[PDB]
Amino acid sequence: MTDYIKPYNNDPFVGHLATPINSSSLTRAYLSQLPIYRRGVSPFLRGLEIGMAHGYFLIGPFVQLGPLRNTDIKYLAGLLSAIGLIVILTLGMLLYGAVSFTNDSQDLESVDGWRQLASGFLLGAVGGAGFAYLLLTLFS
């Protein structure tokens, strides 16, 4: 018994190696459950949900606050700016795999699986901008 087990194991058994607010022991498992870095899957699916999450809310800001927000046409300004930025952002994200070229044997996190998740990101972003598009139409 040296120092009586590290002053109470640094208070009631902390541990938590990959936890300190980066992702709790529940949240790190929630990240493994989270599709952006999902286990047991490859081509398209690691992405796809990425776009279905990003493009889904990209309609949000420019509908109420964008440079166009005072007439009836303004329901479209939230989507045109979003889709234009979606094309720009898709190019910017796809270019990362072109910059990387060291792990050509590790095709998942480098080039192959990288493009095989951004491919789902393109349809996810555009489609997700179209998914939240038809959600506020029946109430208007």
């Binding site: 002053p7 640094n10 208070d11 009631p12 902390v14 927000r69 005072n70």
Partner: protein
């Protein structure tokens, strides 16, 4: 707790004064360099850079305490003198409105007599904004004789402190054991100083209030004012002015406290006669604070065995995220004279700011709210004082990790964690600063773009309704309904800045329900931006002062060092004292924006005039309902319209505030000489002048050298602040006199 005195340690001799630099053998044998001339004064107050014997360091700082204390007493004893020899306080005592304040006269030498401002009362001079007349009126002082007696009584107390700081030293000297009695120290500071101080002044404004309250507020001449001793020598006079004095400390023992309700009340708000807070509420206030401090002054171990102690109090506080928490903090504060100074400078610095806010919010002195120059000056005065003090708190909280922190002696796992996950603290504050910057000032860029672009500012009006009157509006409404409901014993709010539509006017507006709007959310977040950046850089200098990732051997170099060299791409300005040097600058920007906000928003919506045909007409009538949202309005309607009151004064008596205004930019831009150039070029610049000095041998024995790398930056911030305060000092004292 024991009388341990080391009588006679240092003799009384002029021998040390004969040697320039006796405090250090390194600053005595080699005065062959110009740099030594500046090192003699730079280290003159760095007492921990001489001897390490704490029994002598404690016997060199308590000496400086009594020395500074004597300087302050010499300073205060003159204020009562200037308000008697040449002033207008008695005439202002009879006529307070038409007679402007003044307590400084000039002489006919070079035509400077134009500064004699026509204030009235048969005396000309220079207007004052120190609040001396309000304090003296709130003290019951009427005759000039009461000024001279207080001044002559101040000379005695000023001399006794010099003969005290020269007593416990060249004559006496307590041991080192007398300083670890921090337990016995807080029992005499919270009870002897705070306690008896809040009680002694409380017992004064109970018997001196009626020469101000039940006399000077009725309409009696200053000659008809009775004497303060005539009220005490005859208890029935106090009994008639207050029908509670007939008892004379009889229900005080009977616990029939309600019979003392003629002086002890809790009204709230302001008085519609004087112009400030109630003269009876402050007496009861200080009585309430005095008893609380008489209780709070008994908390630590003396020599009877009862009570807590800073030791086991901190040895008991734990916490999950803290680990070995709070323990060792006793050894932190009881060993380093420095260590107490940062927590003092931090608390007292924020205290000066908080009391500055409490000044304008609820004016405690009579005839203070209407006196706009004094009010505006005093707020920003304590504002900048606390700015310097909090940065000094960072300046020394950076000293601690370098000068008095050890990995074996003093230990708190809390402070350990502040240095173990140290890269996380500043990372959080960094992202917070950037989020509060790219938006608060980003929205400034946004709105200034919307106006020059066209119809975008028009569609911003709905967003101008947002944020503003959305938050903090309900807080004011809570305070509107706080009396009666959550304050049954209060017939008024905390201040009339809370009570809506309730305006108190004494020919000039005293307070207003400060209706937030338009851009208060903007400037408050400019504040929070400049506050988080200031806290970031200073806290960075605090916890990165010991362990640094770039250079691991950081403790060897020091605190006020230049850098390391051109290696590692470039190690430049990495000292914690430089985080304070730049910390002074972000504090400078913070306090500058806060004084701008306070000052201008006042006359925008608060300060104004009143007529019977209408209601309220401000000096500048509701301008920052739009001119605050953009950066342009801060120099289109703010920094531009102010030149009509600072420059258009040469034909009057306000010409000095224009000369100091235009001359403060000189010394500020003079700081741009040191904050931009380097010692290398300037050192190549001397040797040419020294060549001309070697041509005629007129070269001094003291070899001409450039300023130190650190001393140049210390002088640079000195001028950036002096030249960066005297301009707004001349500006705050420019318009407020013309529009007073």
């Amino acid at each position: 707790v024991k009388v341990v005195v080391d009588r006679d340690v240092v003799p009384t001799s002029f021998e040390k004064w004969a040697k320039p630099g006796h405090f250090s053998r390194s600053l005595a044998k080699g005065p062959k360099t110009t740099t030594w001339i500046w090192n003699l004064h730079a280290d003159a107050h760095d007492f921990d850079s001489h001897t390490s014997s704490l029994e002598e360091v404690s016997r060199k700082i308590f000496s400086a305490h009594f020395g500074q204390l004597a300087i302050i007493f010499i300073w205060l004893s003159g204020m009562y003198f200037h308000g008697a020899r040449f002033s207008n306080y008695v005439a202002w005592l009879s006529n307070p409105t038409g007679i402007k304040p003044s307590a400084q006269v000039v002489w006919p030498i070079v035509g400077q007599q134009i500064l004699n401002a026509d204030v009235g009362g048969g005396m000309q001079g220079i207007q004052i904004t120190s609040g001396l007349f309000q304090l003296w009126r709130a003290s019951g002082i009427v005759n000039e004789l009461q000024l001279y007696v207080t001044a002559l009584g101040g000379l005695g107390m000023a001399g006794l402190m010099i003969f005290a700081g020269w007593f416990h030293y060249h004559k006496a000297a307590p041991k080192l054991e007398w300083f670890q009695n921090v337990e016995s120290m807080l029992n005499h500071h919270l009870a002897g100083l705070l306690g008896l101080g809040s009680l002694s002044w409380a017992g004064h404004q109970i018997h001196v209030s009626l020469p101000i309250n039940k006399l000077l507020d009725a309409g009696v001449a200053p000659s008809s004012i009775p004497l303060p001793h005539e009220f005490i020598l005859n208890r029935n006079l106090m009994a008639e002015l207050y029908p509670s004095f007939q008892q004379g400390l009889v229900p005080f023992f009977t616990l029939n406290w309600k019979q003392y309700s003629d002086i002890l009340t809790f009204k709230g708000g302001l008085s519609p006669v004087t112009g400030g807070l109630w003269l009876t509420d402050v007496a009861h206030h200080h009585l309430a604070i005095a008893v609380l401090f008489l209780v709070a002054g008994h908390m630590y171990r003396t020599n009877w065995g009862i009570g807590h102690s800073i030791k086991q109090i901190l040895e008991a506080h734990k916490g999950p995220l803290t680990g070995e928490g709070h323990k060792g903090l006793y050894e932190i504060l009881t060993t380093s004279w420095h260590a107490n100074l940062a927590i003092n400078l931090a608390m007292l610095g924020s205290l000066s700011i908080i009391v500055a806010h409490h000044m304008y919010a609820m004016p405690p002195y009579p005839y203070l709210a209407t006196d706009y120059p004094t009010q505006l000056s005093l707020f920003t005065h304590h504002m900048w004082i606390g700015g310097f003090c909090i940065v000094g708190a960072g300046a020394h909280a950076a000293i601690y990790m370098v000068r008095d922190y050890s990995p074996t002696v003093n230990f708190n796992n809390v402070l350990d964690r502040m240095i173990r996950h140290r890269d996380a603290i500043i990372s959080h504050l960094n992202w917070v600063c950037i989020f509060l910057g790219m938006h608060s000032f980003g929205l400034y860029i946004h709105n200034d773009t919307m106006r020059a672009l066209g119809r975008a500012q028009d569609m911003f009006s709905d967003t101008a309704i947002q944020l503003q009157p959305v938050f903090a509006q309900w807080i004011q409404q809570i305070h509107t309904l706080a009396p009666g409901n959550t304050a049954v014993n209060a017939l008024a709010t905390a201040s009339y800045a809370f009570g809506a539509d309730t305006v108190t006017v004494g020919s000039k507006i005293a307070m207003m329900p400060i209706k937030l709007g338009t851009a208060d959310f903007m400037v408050h977040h400019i504040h929070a931006f400049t506050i988080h950046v200031t806290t970031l850089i200073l806290l960075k200098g605090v916890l990165y002062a010991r362990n640094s990732r770039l250079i691991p051997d950081k403790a060897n170099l020091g605190f006020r060092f230049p850098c390391d060299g051109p290696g590692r791409g470039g190690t430049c300005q990495v000292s914690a004292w430089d985080h304070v040097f730049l910390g002074l600058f972000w504090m400078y920007n913070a306090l500058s924006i806060v004084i701008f906000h306070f000052s201008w928003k006042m006359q925008s919506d608060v300060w104004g005039t009143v007529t019977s045909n209408g209601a309220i007409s401000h000096i500048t009538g509701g301008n920052f309902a739009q001119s605050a949202i953009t950066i342009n309005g801060w120099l289109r309607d703010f920094l531009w319209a102010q030149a009509s009151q600072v420059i258009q004064s040469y034909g009057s008596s306000l010409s000095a505030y224009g000369l100091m205004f235009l001359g403060a930019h000189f010394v500020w831009a003079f700081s741009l000489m040191f904050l931009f150039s380097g010692r290398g070029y300037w050192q190549e610049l001397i040797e040419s002048i020294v060549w001309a000095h070697n041509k005629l041998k007129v070269a001094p024995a003291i070899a001409p050298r450039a300023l130190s790398i650190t001393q140049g930056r210390a002088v640079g911030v000195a001028h950036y602040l002096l030249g960066g305060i005297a301009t707004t000092w001349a500006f705050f004292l420019a318009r407020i006199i013309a529009v007073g």
